[PDB]
């Protein structure tokens, strides 16, 4: 997780709005959430990994430890139980709620941070780049 | 809780710059902090409680459960071990780190929300009101 430390800006974004409706995000919200250009900020402090996302939509932040599951209240106001792991080079976050489950993958490609979000079939791709 | 849920704006501060130097914050960052008028958002989602602070300098979103110890990265970037309780009608937060310890009281007083911060002898006082 040392290769993720830094402030990142949103460059591209595709299949996002399609991903939202699958999770169960409201119409009016998907239009404002997807309309935003977040500023993902990852930083570590010992065993703690913080992922602060300052967007024009919401302002979320999650501090955690690898493997140890924690309570997370998503931006779209959804109480989920998340668990982030360093599976094969990437930061794989699995969010469980109401039996349902989604997966946020944060991989790396050269000078970019690629975020993948799966919600059964539909998978979004949002590319980031050092601010 | 529930008597804290809602949005609060800062309307006054006393001994904040005096209290921060005791915590150990740097002159530079101590000046920008006291110059900020943060908005403290407080919500509840089940047994989980979220207190968020939004201002011109540093944004924090601390989600927690009453009486259960949790890891927190303070705005001034300290790796503290916090624990919040409903003590005598007040949301009492205690931050332990490096042997030191600071207490943050969050009580209500009519239409106001009083925040008292104790660090040894000094005590910062900041009041908020519904947005
Ligand atoms: Cl790089
Ligand atoms: Cl009231």
Swiss-Prot record, chains A, B:
UniProt entry keywords in alphabetical sequence: Acetylation, Cytoplasm, Lipid-binding, Nucleus, Phosphoprotein, Transport
Upon changing residue 91 to A, the result is: Abolishes export from nucleus
UniProt cross-references to CDD domains, sorted A to Z: FABP4 (cd19467)
Which InterPro entries did the record assign? Calycin, Fatty_acid-bd, ILBP, Lipocln_cytosolic_FA-bd_dom
Give residue numbers for the modification (Phosphoserine): 12
Per UniProt, where does a fatty acid bind? 126-128
Q: Which residues cross the membrane?
A: none
Q: Name one GO biological process term.
A: long-chain fatty acid transport
User: Can the keyword Hydrolase be found in this entry's annotation?
Assistant: no
Q: Which residues carry this modification: Phosphotyrosine?
A: 19
Cytoplasm as UniProt keyword: yes
Location within or outside the cell:
Cytoplasm; Nucleus
Q: Which residues carry this modification: N-acetylcysteine?
A: 1
- Motif Nuclear localization signal per UniProt: ranges: 21-31
Q: What is this protein called?
A: Fatty acid-binding protein, adipocyte
């Amino acid at each position: 997780c040392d290769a993720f430390v830094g402030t990142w800006k949103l460059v591209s974004s595709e299949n996002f709005d399609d991903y939202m409706k699958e999770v169960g995000v409201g119409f009016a919200t998907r239009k404002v959430a997807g309309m935003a250009k977040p500023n993902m900020i990852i930083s570590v402090n010992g065993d703690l990994v913080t992922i602060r996302s300052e967007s024009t939509f919401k302002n979320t932040e999650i501090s955690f430890k690898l493997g140890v599951e924690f309570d997370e209240i998503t931006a779209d106001d959804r109480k989920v139980k998340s668990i982030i792991t360093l599976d094969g080079g990437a930061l794989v976050q699995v969010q469980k709620w109401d039996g349902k489950s989604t997966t946020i993958k944060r991989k790396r490609d050269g000078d970019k941070l690629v975020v993948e979000c799966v919600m059964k079939g539909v998978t979004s791709t949002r590319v980031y780049e050092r601010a």
